[PDB]
Scaffold this active site. Structure first.
Site, mmCIF file in Angstrom:
data_model
loop_
_atom_site.group_PDB
_atom_site.id
_atom_site.type_symbol
_atom_site.label_atom_id
_atom_site.label_comp_id
_atom_site.label_asym_id
_atom_site.label_seq_id
_atom_site.Cartn_x
_atom_site.Cartn_y
_atom_site.Cartn_z
ATOM 1 N N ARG A 64 0.791 -1.235 0.000
ATOM 2 C CA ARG A 64 0.000 0.000 0.000
ATOM 3 C C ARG A 64 0.817 1.276 0.000
ATOM 4 N NH1 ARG A 64 -3.105 -2.746 3.952
ATOM 5 N NH2 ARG A 64 -4.962 -3.794 3.135
ATOM 6 N N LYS B 263 3.874 11.236 -11.368
ATOM 7 C CA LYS B 263 2.964 10.458 -12.215
ATOM 8 C C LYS B 263 3.636 9.159 -12.600
ATOM 9 C CE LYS B 263 -0.416 13.265 -14.687
ATOM 10 N NZ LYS B 263 -1.004 13.577 -16.016
ATOM 11 N N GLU C 145 10.113 17.001 -25.311
ATOM 12 C CA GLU C 145 9.487 17.412 -24.054
ATOM 13 C C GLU C 145 9.970 18.780 -23.621
ATOM 14 O OE1 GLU C 145 6.987 15.881 -23.338
ATOM 15 O OE2 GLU C 145 7.286 13.955 -22.358
ATOM 16 N N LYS D 90 7.663 22.483 -14.841
ATOM 17 C CA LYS D 90 6.821 21.361 -14.501
ATOM 18 C C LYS D 90 6.541 21.383 -12.985
ATOM 19 C CE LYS D 90 6.167 16.427 -15.003
ATOM 20 N NZ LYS D 90 6.561 15.228 -15.781
ATOM 21 N N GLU E 255 -4.130 16.920 -11.500
ATOM 22 C CA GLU E 255 -4.706 17.359 -12.762
ATOM 23 C C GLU E 255 -6.173 17.690 -12.647
ATOM 24 O OE1 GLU E 255 -3.893 14.627 -16.072
ATOM 25 O OE2 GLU E 255 -3.805 16.367 -17.393
ATOM 26 N N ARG F 137 -2.833 21.190 -14.813
ATOM 27 C CA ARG F 137 -1.859 20.181 -15.216
ATOM 28 C C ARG F 137 -2.088 19.689 -16.642
ATOM 29 N NH1 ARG F 137 1.098 15.692 -11.405
ATOM 30 N NH2 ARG F 137 2.459 14.895 -13.077
ATOM 31 N N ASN G 201 0.248 18.252 -20.973
ATOM 32 C CA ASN G 201 -0.149 17.245 -21.953
ATOM 33 C C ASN G 201 -0.299 17.774 -23.357
ATOM 34 O OD1 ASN G 201 -2.260 14.378 -22.089
ATOM 35 N ND2 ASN G 201 -0.314 14.528 -20.978
ATOM 36 N N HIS H 298 0.062 15.629 -26.517
ATOM 37 C CA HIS H 298 -0.135 14.245 -26.092
ATOM 38 C C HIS H 298 -1.483 13.644 -26.420
ATOM 39 C CE1 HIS H 298 3.516 15.306 -24.112
ATOM 40 N NE2 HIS H 298 3.619 14.158 -23.462
ATOM 41 N N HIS I 182 -0.397 10.541 -27.959
ATOM 42 C CA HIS I 182 -0.710 9.247 -27.345
ATOM 43 C C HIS I 182 -1.531 8.357 -28.282
ATOM 44 C CE1 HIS I 182 -0.082 10.133 -22.765
ATOM 45 N NE2 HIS I 182 0.946 9.491 -23.289
ATOM 46 N N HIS J 145 8.283 7.789 -27.500
ATOM 47 C CA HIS J 145 7.341 8.744 -26.945
ATOM 48 C C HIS J 145 7.560 10.124 -27.504
ATOM 49 C CE1 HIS J 145 4.476 10.479 -24.224
ATOM 50 N NE2 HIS J 145 5.383 11.208 -23.602
HETATM 51 O O1 LIG Z 1 -6.302 -0.440 9.406
HETATM 52 C C1 LIG Z 1 -7.346 -1.093 9.040
HETATM 53 O O2 LIG Z 1 -8.357 -0.581 8.530
HETATM 54 C C2 LIG Z 1 -7.272 -2.618 9.281
HETATM 55 O O3 LIG Z 1 -6.217 -2.876 10.188
HETATM 56 C C3 LIG Z 1 -6.912 -3.215 7.893
HETATM 57 C C4 LIG Z 1 -6.861 -4.778 7.971
HETATM 58 C C5 LIG Z 1 -6.246 -5.304 6.671
HETATM 59 P P1 LIG Z 1 -4.427 -5.169 6.518
HETATM 60 O O4 LIG Z 1 -3.805 -5.782 7.835
HETATM 61 O O5 LIG Z 1 -4.063 -6.033 5.323
HETATM 62 O O6 LIG Z 1 -3.972 -3.765 6.351
HETATM 63 C C6 LIG Z 1 -8.249 -5.311 8.356
HETATM 64 O O7 LIG Z 1 -8.290 -6.697 8.310
HETATM 65 C C7 LIG Z 1 -8.594 -4.784 9.813
HETATM 66 O O8 LIG Z 1 -9.886 -5.271 10.237
HETATM 67 C C8 LIG Z 1 -8.569 -3.244 9.859
HETATM 68 O O1 LIG Z 2 1.346 15.580 -16.184
HETATM 69 C C1 LIG Z 2 2.483 15.165 -16.617
HETATM 70 O O2 LIG Z 2 3.535 15.170 -15.937
HETATM 71 C C2 LIG Z 2 2.495 14.648 -18.087
HETATM 72 O O3 LIG Z 2 1.479 15.330 -18.805
HETATM 73 C C3 LIG Z 2 2.100 13.149 -18.020
HETATM 74 C C4 LIG Z 2 2.265 12.463 -19.427
HETATM 75 C C5 LIG Z 2 1.749 11.037 -19.324
HETATM 76 P P1 LIG Z 2 -0.028 10.834 -19.129
HETATM 77 O O4 LIG Z 2 -0.721 11.620 -20.312
HETATM 78 O O5 LIG Z 2 -0.282 9.338 -19.248
HETATM 79 O O6 LIG Z 2 -0.497 11.371 -17.839
HETATM 80 C C6 LIG Z 2 3.726 12.608 -19.907
HETATM 81 O O7 LIG Z 2 4.009 11.857 -21.050
HETATM 82 C C7 LIG Z 2 3.976 14.120 -20.149
HETATM 83 O O8 LIG Z 2 5.287 14.319 -20.723
HETATM 84 C C8 LIG Z 2 3.851 14.868 -18.822
HETATM 85 ZN ZN LIG Z 3 5.343 12.967 -22.586
#
Ligand SMILES: O=C(O)[C@]1(O)C[C@H](CP(=O)(O)O)[C@@H](O)[C@H](O)C1
Ligand SMILES: O=C(O)[C@]1(O)C[C@H](CP(=O)(O)O)[C@@H](O)[C@H](O)C1
Ligand SMILES: [Zn+2]
Ligand SMILES: Nc1ncnc2c1ncn2[C@@H]1O[C@H](COP(=O)(O)OP(=O)(O)O)[C@@H](O)[C@H]1O
Ligand SMILES: Nc1ncnc2c1ncn2[C@@H]1O[C@H](COP(=O)(O)OP(=O)(O)O)[C@@H](O)[C@H]1O
Ligand SMILES: [Cl-]
Ligand SMILES: [Zn+2]
Lengths: 388, 388
Positions: free
Chosen positions: A127, A149, A191, A247, A257, A261, A265, A268, A272, A284
């Site tokens: 996470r 990004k 760029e 930037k 964005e 922001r 783009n 792009h 893209h 690119h």
């Molecule tokens: O911080 C939370 O929300 C939790 O600790 C999050 C866990 C999942 P995690 O240990 O994978 O973060 C969940 O099982 C628990 O009941 C509550």
């Molecule tokens: O917000 C940014 O930093 C960008 O717009 C982000 C793009 C990728 P995205 O269009 O997938 O966000 C990048 O190629 C560009 O040079 C800069």
């Molecule tokens: Zn780019």
């Protein structure tokens, strides 16, 4: 040494020789951890990781207990920015003994591919873990490494899945440019040019004048010792920094964005759409260069941009060895048999993340260094088709 | 109609009958969008989505241009929390006509599996789209749906990859409990009990007093369509709300689990280590119940928790039909031939997201409704082994 702040923090340190003598130390002091994961590809690794392992042990010898360094090497190419690679990387880290925990500090050593990939893995690993950017290409130095990004590609388009995860540190070491292939350097100039075109006529004009000198240095031979950019470094640093600083500003004012922001783009929307068709044969920056030209043509079409500006954009991109049309010589032979239908391009633009619902949003410049709106403008399909 | 505030916003609305006459309307007014994606499994869908499609068209009829409601039904079971299902839901959204854009509002209709999954997809879809939680299970209503924690499982453990993405709205509709299987209801009581044990001996006493009544309303044999929890709803709401409110507080004070939030993981250090071995045969709550018992035994072992407290936690969990040991009758026949080795459990705790480096961390209660530290305490392996 230049320090640029972004989103209330000085995560940007720019100088020459950071990798060799600064990143190793700074990481262990400002990114305290028991685990550090280095991600990079085989090409950048064989050239740059060795020196780091030593710089690491050296600065980690003094810390008790001593943290660890783990190096992951993936197949270089815009082909590793995928679900599988991000999966292997995550599993890999998890298999470690001990496993890589939430205190892990991930180091992104590479261009936009390794940067986007590494940063995304870091954003969702258990996470969220810390990470830093060590942009080794021009494009990653003046654009991709800054802003937080990250994303990966899916069979349908570019950067469709990702996250906005700000890196703790961003080390811009100009020394990397010494070994960057010629095509890559030009590719990134797209760029730089783009960033100037949406910020200042001054900077853009500067880039026009630097053309010859910069391009002559990049093409230069160089013997094991002297650094290309000999006598053009002040110019290089000045241009790169200008791009990075702008930037930083934009990202700061509208990180997720919400509007402003959008301007980063420019070129792009069409870029893209084209890149999803001509990748990986086409890079690119090369696709964005063509996108800047078509989007510019679109702004003139709408009576927003002056024709003289459209020509000047083309001349500037051309002066740097960048393509200005899908009919370009080099781009023709490189696709081999690939061609963009107005239909496919329109189908892919439907996938533009900037779109608000089914309303396609493209950045329209009213003049060089002056956007039409402080965001992407809503444009109708029929108008897009005319320039395609 | 009760509302709870989490992380500075009253995004939690709790009442009976929200799904039928509210969610639909509120969504269209407070979550303006052209696209809404409903995610749920076949079990909950056939019972609950029909009524919603109607409630939706009804409240969207006045809206122009007409917004859309797309539906995704995944298979039930922890099996859906996988890199593939997340890739299927994503490729699906990206494949609608027109593609689902950043204005998409994703609706999580299900328990912890669908909630964790749906929320994670939303966190990385085009780098982030809005989403709401419609917890249909006890566990989700009193825990998993609040807090923004989302993730998926990898071959190595539970919730190893995910993100902290706060939902825009959280609708707690007690009416869902009417059709929730008996096992599930008990399973979720583990979380309720856990939340009380780390917050107040008062709430934890009302839980003790309601065991008989709550469990009798739950086990009563009913025909399809008729209700239970009649004459006990005020009790139910009161207990559910208490758990939700406490989690809200915790999450607000330490959104990204830097300290405080560790407490919500009481019983999960050992619970998760066990769950990674006995899943999917054994449910989360059931594993956590055993985890709470062993973690509590551990607190007494360290001279932090009083024995009378450990034997009250056991009695309470037992009173709810929840297991209190790996030797439990039901849990013995359900595993069939599966048994947890002490070395294995230890191995699985290496992967515990709370650990500071290689230092395992566990929540230790010094008393019922009173944690030892305002965070997880560092515990040595040898001490963990003794309660295993
Ligand atoms: O911080 C939370 O929300 C939790 O600790 C999050 C866990 C999942 P995690 O240990 O994978 O973060 C969940 O099982 C628990 O009941 C509550
Ligand atoms: O917000 C940014 O930093 C960008 O717009 C982000 C793009 C990728 P995205 O269009 O997938 O966000 C990048 O190629 C560009 O040079 C800069
Ligand atoms: Zn780019
Ligand atoms: N400093 C460098 N010197 C040598 N090879 C490099 C350097 N930077 C990156 N490369 C290689 O250049 C190629 C393009 O880099 P990539 O990160 O894909 O592009 P970009 O940064 O333009 O998005 C890759 O094959 C990579 O291994
Ligand atoms: N109120 C409900 N009525 C009927 N089946 C339900 C209800 N809520 C969800 N289910 C089913 O309950 C089971 C367990 O829910 P799940 O989300 O996997 O776990 P939990 O919410 O306990 O973490 C699933 O098979 C699911 O289809
Ligand atoms: Cl992902
Ligand atoms: Zn839990």
């Amino acid at each position: 040494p230049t320090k640029i702040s972004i989103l209330g923090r000085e995560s940007i340190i720019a100088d020459f020789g950071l990798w060799r003598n600064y990143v190793a130390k700074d990481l262990i002091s400002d990114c305290s951890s028991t685990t550090y994961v280095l991600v990079t590809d085989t090409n950048i690794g064989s050239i740059y990781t060795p020196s780091f392992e030593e710089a690491f042990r050296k600065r980690a010898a003094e810390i008790t207990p001593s943290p660890r360094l783990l190096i992951y090497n993936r197949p270089p190419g815009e082909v590793s920015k995928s679900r599988q690679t991000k999966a292997d990387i995550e599993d890999w880290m998890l298999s470690q003994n001990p496993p890589c925990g939430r205190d892990t500090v991930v180091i992104a050593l590479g261009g936009g591919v390794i940067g986007d990939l590494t940063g995304f893995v870091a954003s969702t690993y258990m996470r969220g873990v810390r990470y830093v950017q060590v942009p080794t290409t021009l494009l990653a130095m003046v654009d991709s490494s800054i802003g937080g990004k990250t994303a990966i590609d899916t069979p349908l388009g570019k950067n469709l899945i990702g996250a906005i995860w700000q890196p703790t540190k961003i080390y811009i070491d100009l020394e990397f440019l010494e070994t960057l292939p010629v095509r890559e350097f030009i590719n990134g100039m797209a760029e730089v040019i783009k960033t100037a075109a949406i910020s200042s006529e001054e900077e853009f004009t500067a880039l026009e004048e630097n053309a010859e000198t910069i391009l002559k240095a990049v093409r230069r031979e160089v013997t094991p010792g002297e650094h290309r950019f000999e006598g053009t470094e002040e110019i290089l640093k000045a241009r790169i920094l200008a791009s990075a600083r702008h930037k930083a500003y934009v990202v700061s004012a509208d990180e997720r964005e919400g509007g402003l922001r959008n301007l980063l783009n420019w070129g792009h929307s069409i870029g893209h759409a084209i890149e999803a068709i001509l990748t990986p044969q086409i890079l690119h920056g090369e696709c964005v260069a063509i996108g800047m030209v078509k989007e510019a043509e679109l702004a003139r079409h709408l009576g927003i941009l002056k024709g003289v500006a459209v020509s000047r954009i083309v001349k500037c991109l051309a002066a740097y060895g960048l393509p200005t049309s899908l009919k370009d010589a080099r781009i023709r032979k490189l696709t081999a048999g690939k061609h963009c239908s107005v239909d496919q391009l329109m189908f892919n633009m439907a996938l533009d993340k900037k779109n608000d619902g089914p309303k396609k949003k493209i950045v329209l410049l009213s003049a060089i260094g002056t956007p039409y709106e402080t965001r992407a403008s809503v444009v109708a399909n029929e108008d897009i088709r005319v320039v395609l």
